[PDB]
Design a protein around this nucleic acid. Structure first.
Lengths: 217, 212, 212, 217
DNA sequence: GCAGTACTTAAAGTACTGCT
DNA sequence: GCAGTACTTAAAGTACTGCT
């Protein structure tokens, strides 16, 4: 499943499905600081203030099949072609990438021994590093580090969490519709911060951002 | 996919997406193995290979699936005695703390990565090794769909401890291996569930009270 | 893989390695279609899609497989009459030339590609279209393992002529389609085998003499 | 299944299995100008002159997974590293590739209409182009053009046919052994002609040979 | 009795919503 | 009753030798 990426009225917009809770685009609601997924077709969204606690969590990627024609790379290229992302915008990004030399993957994942025991069972603490940044427009950008599945080493994944108040139409006080996708106008600052997130996530991601940004300049 | 269960269990080794998957230790982490493209080593590296079984306790509300089936079929044979059940039931009554009580923590840290606040997520795991080489793992995960936690029990069986020997050989199609379950593995698996969470414990206690 | 056989045959469409595979005309050539990743078009391009069946006549020495099963099950129902069989048997007695008689030729040519002599291999094919849109192909190949030739009969059925309609949709898992075999398709398939080679012809004549 | 490529005593040698008749390495015997495969474990090779009619037909490739570490590229690189293929050898090859501008795939594959009919069935002739070259050492080099399986366009495959008299041990008058592979010392001239065959086969293959030859120079 | 060989798509697999 | 979603290996498939 893919989100539709488009340009309209001077804005990059993407259409996010809200009835696919097992996809990389899922609607969550925070209860006491943790995100919990939401059945958008059985539970009908609240018509009140607790709606801000609801948000869309999107695991956003940059590259696919070694090409930069996927999600964030499609948004950035469209933003470039319609003058939404300027020359100085891209120039500032590459000078930021040239100065970045420590990455989120440098923190690693570690299993720490404990002085604790559970009725004969040894107790360990697996420590995973994450990076989080809140933007003034309301969105959150997350970077988590996990183990590479099929090989040794780490892989870093970027998340963006979009408050439901930042998308249209207003779902307040109603249940999602069948195959309902939602329109989200992407601020340029979020695209720059998303590219920043990939730059600092790992050296592998940075080289992908750099090679892509240099190709459109 | 299901496994068919001196208690004997037959484990599929050609389904890496299952709850039962072949792995090998590489750089200290479990890595999926392509059991049909790669010949298993015949040297000492074979000890690095193991079968990881995400073992369950119940299914369809009744206690006749995997571990609950082993334990009842073992207790019936006199393999697990009345005192074996009392000890586990006594052990369960002694248990207050569970791994879920530790929970998952996001500890704030005072470092910044180019305008990004850095945090650390702390996931707790219980681990126990048995003299014959098997490992029992208990891992904590956020309760999917709901608020809370979900605990899962894993058993890791070295490929050395199953028949036939896979050394110098690629696995066969729908290949299933012989593993004789040691008695203490069954009891340690139950104690793993008893300490996983109160929910699992009351579930284990209800089953052990049923056959005692 | 096998297909289950007004004569009705059920054809699997999610097995592109089979004798029965879904194809589409692209640049004038049959191209395998990924029936589960790609939604079939709902527009006029659907006519470009077809099922290619490498159909056989016999199996296990007896004539109750695919075409031989259709023909006997059709002849029994009165669908194929005695005169229908005589005409095919008469047609077979009229046939002298077969596609195998053409053989595969390597014609020498007087051109050189940077020190390499260029040749041309000439493979003969028999092709027939039926008014309802199906095609019958006969192709020649070197007899594998032995000296000689081997002839194979193909039938190409447009996706328009099968149910349900696959338009605007990806195929289902182990999906099988409805195809009602027209009577003249059965008779033209037999004539295809009769003209493929003397070996096939005597094979067809032996079967038609058995049910007449 | 892969053939073992090695260097020994100043020679590039490859070990060719002779009991895998369904692989890309198969033992054939010519009967009246066509190659026919041979069951090397039931039929015991002749102890006479008709042994020359027996040969090993090897569909040899150059690249695998976009890398040049496979079959012919492994033989050529080893030949390079042990001074079997010299600088002038590789230089002459690239100047030959720079001059080649017509390819075997330029002949195309065509279905020709006929004035012939087979009892109501239309008759066509499918014409496939092949290229063949005999070398003084006895081997034959073949290039056949076929249709690309999963896509439109052509793909060209190179064959080399090795007389059994050119390999050791002598299989004369005996049946092949279980898992028997056979030692074939590769003349340098055949490697150059094999690279030539890939150069003239298609423009796609030539760019692969050129990029590989320039990388080892 | 079964693999070897070739090559690519479709299937297996886990688990809840959600779709038609 | 079944797909949607995620992702990767193993299975399907054709047909004869050949292997263990």
């Amino acid at each position: 499943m893919e989100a539709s990426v488009s340009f309209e009225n001077g804005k990059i917009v993407v259409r996010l499905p809200i009835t696919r809770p097992t996809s990389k685009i899922r609607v969550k609601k925070i209860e006491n600081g943790v995100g919990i997924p939401v059945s958008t077709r059985k539970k009908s969204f609240p018509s009140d203030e607790n709606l801000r606690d609801y948000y869309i969590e999107w695991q956003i990627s940059f590259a696919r099949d070694g090409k930069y024609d996927y999600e964030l790379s499609r948004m950035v290229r469209l933003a470039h072609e319609h003058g939404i992302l300027t020359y100085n915008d891209i120039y500032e990004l590459l000078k930021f990438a040239d100065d970045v030399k420590s990455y989120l993957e440098d923190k690693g994942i570690r299993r720490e021994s404990t002085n604790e025991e559970l009725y004969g069972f040894n107790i360990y603490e697996d420590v995973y590093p994450v990076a989080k940044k809140e933007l003034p427009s309301g969105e959150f950008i997350g970077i988590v580090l996990k183990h590479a599945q099929r090989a040794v080493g780490y892989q870093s994944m970027v998340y963006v969490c979009i408050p439901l108040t930042n998308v249209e139409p207003s779902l307040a006080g109603r249940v999602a519709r069948r195959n309902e996708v939602v329109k989200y106008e992407v601020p340029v600052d979020l695209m720059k911060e998303l590219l920043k997130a990939f730059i600092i996530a790992s050296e592998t991601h940075k080289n992908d951002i750099v090679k892509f940004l240099r190709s459109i300049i």
